[PDB]
Amino acid sequence: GAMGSMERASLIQKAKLAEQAERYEDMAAFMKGAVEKGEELSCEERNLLSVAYKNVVGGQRAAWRVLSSIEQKSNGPEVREYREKVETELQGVCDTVLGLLDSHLIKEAGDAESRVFYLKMKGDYYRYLAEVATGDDKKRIIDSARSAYQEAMDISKKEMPPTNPIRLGLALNFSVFHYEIANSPEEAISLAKTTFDEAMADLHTLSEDSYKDSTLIMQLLRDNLTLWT
Amino acid sequence: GAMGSMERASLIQKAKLAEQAERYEDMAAFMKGAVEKGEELSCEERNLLSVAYKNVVGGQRAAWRVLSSIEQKSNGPEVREYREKVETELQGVCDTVLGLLDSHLIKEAGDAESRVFYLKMKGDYYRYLAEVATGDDKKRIIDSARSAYQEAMDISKKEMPPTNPIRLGLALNFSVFHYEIANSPEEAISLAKTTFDEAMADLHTLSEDSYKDSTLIMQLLRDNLTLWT
Amino acid sequence: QRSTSTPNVH
Amino acid sequence: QRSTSTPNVH
Ligand SMILES: *CC(=O)NCC1CCN(S(=O)(=O)c2ccc(Cl)cc2)CC1
Ligand SMILES: *CC(=O)NCC1CCN(S(=O)(=O)c2ccc(Cl)cc2)CC1
Ligand SMILES: [Cl-]
Ligand SMILES: [Cl-]
């Protein structure tokens, strides 16, 4: 890799500079390099990894949706060609993330936090592929997403309080999977409502160092429920 | 080039799709390909070219300023190394623009509009290089900027009404050159004030199809004067 | 509005 | 605030 000669700590440092500069492709590149050193990521480093790649693929998804909308609104080859160029790029970024997760990050040992977060991350990026997939690949991508989310859910229910932000964010994102990718509006509303209600029932488990994250996700759960009802 | 096999009209079409998708690097790539077909650009195409590359280099300048601020605020090699990486990228984009201008766009014939706009564009991108330049290269870049702006100014004064948006935008950008790059606050205030006052004196020359652009630049001239006084 | 997923924080 | 140059339009 292009980062192989750089020290891990310099890679972390530079990802933080790139975040400050809103250079999220660079930031993602630095974090990939950090991951490839083969050591586990701390909580702060996992956030850097997550923020960088979500920013990259977020811009790609938003581009793809504009071009897809234009494509269907006109249903020459230019719109389809350009949409496939963005779609191919997006798939390449998702494959890079999923490869890092399999080659380096997802393990049987380590934190419940770390293990849930990477399985959630695997679920998300399969979901991003599922957004642009068709046919003999779509249902296979959908099942890899469901399977990764489900494992993360089992672990989180067993090992995390119901207000934990990874547990909540995972549940939010699984419910979005249900509603948008699996077309199971009932499962979506049922998971989101349970997640929110169990969070309030054990509201006392909020952590001093993450309660702002927790209460944000709880509100987003309620936003989705309002939308879906 | 990577666009050599694509038809000019498809290149224009795709630059417009990329603008819609906020994919300004792609947009810039498509427009470069269009320029390299060797035919003149219309007014709409010049705007596509301008918007794409200004968006690219704008993100690079903003990144460079954050990293430069951090660098000086700490005066390890990481900040300087990363700043030089962004700076090298920025210079590469400016060289690409300036090369297109010399190899293809700047000519002795054609519109006064077209000739002023490309010389203004040459002035801007030398100014962007001048923002990150040092020493045995700085004053040489500053003079190529001044020289290009000055030629554009002579032509615009001779051949365009004083409310023309290219003439105004050029004058705005030359005055920014004076104030920030040349450190001639007097020349800046004197050019900006003259430009604004002559615009109002011949306010009747506003064009039906560009008056919103004209009145925007006039306000920005007044904004700079307020700042500078 | 489409469904909202986990945002980026810090 | 720094000096304002020509913006992007349309
Ligand atoms: C401490 C740790 O393990 N990592 C930081 C993680 C960043 C990504 N999230 S998340 O995507 O689950 C999430 C949750 C809540 C909010 Cl507001 C944003 C992101 C897990 C923690
Ligand atoms: C019609 C034409 O020749 N080109 C469109 C050009 C786009 C770039 N400008 S400018 O950079 O001078 C400018 C002027 C005013 C505003 Cl509001 C934005 C940009 C010249 C015209
Ligand atoms: Cl394409
Ligand atoms: Cl670097």
Ligand SMILES: [Mg+2]
């Ligand atoms: Mg090391």
Ligand SMILES: [Mg+2]
């Ligand atoms: Mg494809």
Ligand SMILES: [Mg+2]
């Ligand atoms: Mg209770």
Ligand SMILES: [Mg+2]
């Ligand atoms: Mg052709």
Ligand SMILES: [Mg+2]
């Ligand atoms: Mg340099």
Ligand SMILES: [Mg+2]
């Ligand atoms: Mg008058």
